[PDB]
From Swiss-Prot:
Residues involved in hydrogencarbonate 1 binding: T114, R118, A120, G121
Transferrin-like domain span: 4-330, 342-667
Pfam family, one: Transferrin
Residues that, per the record, bind Fe(3+) 2: D392, Y428, Y521, H589
GO cellular component, one term: recycling endosome
UniProt-recorded name of the protein: Ovotransferrin
Example GO biological process: response to xenobiotic stimulus
Listed SMART domains: TR_FER
Coiled-coil positions: none
Annotated source species: Gallus gallus
InterPro entries cross-referenced by the UniProt entry: Transferrin, Transferrin-like_dom, Transferrin_Fe_BS
């Protein structure tokens, strides 16, 4: 058959691996073992098609993902928690009950660490100490990070250290191997016993370490909280140094992946936590020889959660931790450039081009990053490779789930209403549009041809299809009109039928970008005009494409009488009486960013609109809210942009009535990105 090759890192862990192997043979997918010297050798193997997997610490998933390895975290350990047990843990500083020093007197003491470059055992502590000024270190140019740590503590045990002598002084073992990544005083448990045997005044481990090593003697220990205090070991929640991503199984980004999951999945039930076999995949935990704890998988794991395919290590660790690990590899001083020009995310050719113009006009204050899929933006902002993008009400939801917050929102009422008080509401209306001679009524759509802006957007889909999903109570939307068009929709479906494409080289029909013709508010309007019976859209869409407000081969001659609105139920009405005949009133499009960037781009974007707003300084050179009826970067309807009060969550912005429609609706068939974020934002 096909045997998944698992890499190991110690004789003990090797035995472990094989024992499982024997038992995992008659399985569809089988297992095999490959011992190596260090976790780093195992990474190279897998990368060089010599191995197939291995579970790493967060600090090491970060390396596995770096080039030329670029491994992918396919599965994540799960831990016992009260909130709900997910894929994360806590870093604590454990000391002896009775000693008196506070985290503030750590200087001069001795310490015990799990392994160099590990999360709880070194990254959180050292970085936190470098952060607090306790340890002096400006960058790799002020000296090695070890040299500093060794000048802080008197002696320590850092399994993995090779530069500083003192960092191996407190280690127990053979003079030649007492400072290894598998040495006795290594890992969470080793680091604990190191502290136990007086070799250290502190141990940097995870919230469970003291429990899986000396349960009945917990009262003889305390935690060293950040605020200067000491607290009982069971108070890790109100006294830890951080929360990190659980260890993960990393592998090559290829067809195998899927299969391995099969091995680890079958491997779970048969040898899981509730297992009966004399064999355990996870621990079990508790007192025991440190040399036998955390083999292949930490004894504290209780499951393995499959990781959404869109996930890459950098996404996995989170922007803060990932930047921390960076901090200690590169010098600082430098930076400055970058952090003072918004990196706007453009989607499609038409947008980059408009953005390009904005980049030069802003003389540098704005640089652009083109992507093809509007969701690509979100992921680029999460990683920090991008700072901001204005999303439609429906996508703001996903951006929110992904951790991005709405900081600025467009207003459509009056270019002079973004600095309001009582006049607080900012919104627009969704409407169903049809022809004059047309014999289509909202209750005839049982088989008419329809036009949608893009799948997932407020007016062209969420709201419309929402009214169906709420009615029918069904999730299948493709089979409700004989045919229509809604970008981003199933290339081979009734709904892409009416769609026209790009027009040239590589098709591009039904794509969710300006590239596809019927894409967007006016695109749909077109489709109605030349191909369908109904168009779902904004309340001002009709007026924008009529009245010489557009000179496209079609709209060139359009009047807003050759169109009528479809009133929720019953009749039709003048395209002007939308406040009385609309599908719904919705949340205005918004600029979204990382919570920590809110201060900057909300300020730099104010300086910009000032220069290129509806009535701005240099509107002559460039205007942020104009696009040839194609709503590029911002919706043409935008009169100005208003600041969303600091601390506003996406849910509070989208409004409840609306928020409720996307949540459930989005449950019908979640997008790739939405599974990957939900995985991050806890479960
Ligand atoms: C052991 C190595 O495994 C790889 O996956 C295979 O493609 C090669 O045969 C090679 O021998
Ligand atoms: Fe760890
Ligand atoms: Fe919209």
């Amino acid at each position: 058959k096909s045997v998944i090759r698992w890499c190991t890192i110690s004789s003990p862990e090797e035995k472990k691996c094989n024992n499982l192997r024997d038992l995992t043979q008659q399985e569809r997918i089988s297992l095999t073992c490959v011992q190596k010297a260090t976790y780093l050798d195992c990474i190279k193997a897998i990368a060089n098609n010599e191995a197939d997997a291995i579970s790493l610490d967060g600090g090491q998933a970060f390396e596995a993902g770096l080039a030329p390895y670029k491994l992918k975290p396919i599965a994540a350990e799960v831990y016992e928690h009260t909130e709900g047990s997910t894929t994360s843990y806590y870093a604590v500083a454990v000391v002896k009950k009775g000693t008196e020093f506070t985290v503030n007197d750590l200087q001069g003491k001795t310490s015990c660490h799990t392994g160099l470059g590990r999360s709880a055992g070194w990254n959180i502590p050292i970085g936190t100490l470098l952060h607090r000024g306790a340890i002096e270190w400006e960058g790799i140019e002020s000296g090695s990070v070890e040299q500093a740590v060794a000048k802080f503590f008197s002696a320590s045990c850092v399994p993995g250290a090779t530069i500083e002598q003192k960092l191996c002084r407190q280690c127990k073992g053979d003079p030649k191997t007492k400072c290894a990544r598998n040495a006795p005083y290594s890992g969470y448990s080793g680091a604990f016993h190191c502290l136990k045997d007086g070799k250290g005044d502190v141990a940097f481990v995870k919230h469970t370490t003291v429990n899986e090593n000396a349960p009945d003697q917990k009262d003889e220990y305390e935690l060293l909280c950040l605020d200067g205090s000491r607290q009982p070991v069971d108070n890790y929640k109100t006294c830890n140094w951080a929360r990190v991503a659980a260890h993960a199984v990393v592998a090559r980004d290829d067809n195998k992946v899927e299969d391995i999951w099969s091995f680890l999945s079958k491997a779970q039930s048969d040898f899981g936590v509730d297992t009966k076999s004399d064999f355990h995949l996870f621990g079990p935990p508790g007192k025991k020889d440190p040399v036998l704890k955390d083999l292949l998988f930490k004894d504290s794991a209780i499951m393995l959660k499959r990781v959404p395919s869109l996930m890459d290590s950098q996404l996995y660790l989170g922007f803060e931790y990932y930047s921390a690990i960076q901090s200690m590899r590169k010098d600082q001083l430098t930076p400055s450039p970058r952090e003072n020009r918004i990196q706007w995310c453009a989607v499609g050719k038409d947008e980059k081009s408009k953005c390009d113009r904005w980049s030069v006009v802003s003389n540098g204050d704005v640089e652009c990053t083109v992507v093809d899929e509007t969701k690509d933006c979100i992921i680029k902002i999460m990683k920090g490779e991008a700072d901001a993008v204005a999303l439609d009400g429906g996508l703001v939801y996903t951006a929110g789930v992904c951790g991005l917050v709405p900081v600025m929102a467009e207003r459509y009422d009056d270019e002079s209403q973004c600095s309001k008080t009582d006049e607080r509401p900012a919104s627009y209306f969704a409407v169903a549009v049809a022809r004059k001679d047309s014999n289509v009524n909202w209750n005839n759509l049982k088989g008419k041809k329809s036009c949608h802006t893009a799948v997932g957007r407020t007016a062209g889909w969420v709201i419309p299809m929402g009214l169906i999903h709420n009615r029918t109570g069904t999730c299948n939307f493709d089979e409700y009109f004989s045919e229509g068009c809604a970008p981003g929709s199933p290339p081979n479906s009734r709904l892409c039928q009416l769609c026209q494409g790009s027009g040239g080289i590589p098709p591009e029909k039904c794509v969710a970008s300006s590239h596809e013709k019927y894409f967007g508010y006016t695109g749909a309007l077109r489709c109605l005009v030349e191909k369908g019976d109904v168009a779902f859209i904004q309340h001002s869409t009709v007026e924008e494409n009529t009245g010489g407000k557009n000179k496209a081969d079609w709209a060139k001659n359009l009047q807003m009488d050759d169109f009528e609105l479809l009133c929720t139920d019953g009749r039709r009405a003048n395209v002007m009486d939308y406040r009385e005949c609309n599908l719904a009133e919705v949340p205005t499009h918004a600029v979204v960013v990382r919570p920590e960037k809110a201060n900057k781009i909300r300020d730099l974007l104010e300086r910009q609109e000032k220069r290129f707003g509806v009535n701005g300084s240099e509107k002559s050179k460039f205007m942020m809210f104009e696009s040839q009826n194609k709503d590029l970067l911002f919706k043409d309807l935008t009169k100005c942009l208003f600041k969303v009060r600091e601390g506003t969550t996406y849910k509070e912005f989208l409004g409840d009535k609306f928020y409720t429609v996307i949540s459930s609706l989005k449950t019908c068939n979640p997008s790739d990105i939405l599974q990957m974020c939900s995985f991050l934002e806890g479960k």
